Amino acid sequence: GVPPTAELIKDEAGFETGSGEPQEDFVADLSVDQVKQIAEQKHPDLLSYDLTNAAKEVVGTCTSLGVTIE
Amino acid sequence: IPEWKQEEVDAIVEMIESRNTLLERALDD
RNA sequence: UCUCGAGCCCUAGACAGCCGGGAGGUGAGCUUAGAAGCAGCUACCCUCUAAGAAAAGCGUAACAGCUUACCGGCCGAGGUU
Q: Which nucleotide is nearest to A8 (CA to C1')?
């Protein structure tokens, strides 16, 4: 249903392509709030019961691309 | 006497409080 | 084929076999017209959970599909190095 994570990040990130090396080459950043929203756009595509876990799922692809947090 | 089997039973006994052999083990307490 | 020894695993059920489960984010990112475990490069993280790799071996034009790991059951005594 709801589009995949991959893109949803690049939308509220301002960039288009991930770096050659994740976590090593930081492409973009994301406030904790920003991640709390995506964790809502995908309430179905995920197995978590609480929004807490849902975040961990979303907050899995990020750092593995260069998406730091604040 | 693996520690993971010991931690399992205690974890099962914890749920009951509120593998088949392990379940029997827990229920046996 | 016989005999002797050492390490480790096992009735909290080992070894093998057979049956069942092998699930979501997500076809990871990059590369590319495309590549989705499985061309290459890099990373290799977390949910549900008794398990289940950012995938070990085939397979595909790429998918699909078939299995391994991993968990559970049946079985019941030694097994393995």
A: C25
Method used to obtain the model: X-ray
**Cα gap B21→B25, rounded to integer Å:** 6
Nucleotide closest to residue A10 (CA–C1'): C29
Q: Which segments within A1-70 are labelled E, that is strand?
A: 28-30, 67-69
Find out whether A62 and A22 touch, Cβ atoms under 8 Å. Answer: no
Tokens representing A46 are 């995920």
The distance (Å) linking the CA of A14 with the C1' of C69 is: 40
**Which domains does chain A show, CATH number per domain?**
1-70 (1.10.10.250)
Q: Mind giving me the DSSP string for B1-29? A: --HHHHHHHHHHHHHHH--HHHHHHHHT-
Resolution for this PDB entry, in angstroms: 2.2
Tally of CB atoms within 10 A around A66:
20
Would you say A62 and A70 are in contact if contact means Cβ atoms under 8 Å apart?
Answer: no
> Which residue has its C-alpha nearest to nucleotide C72's C1'?
B19
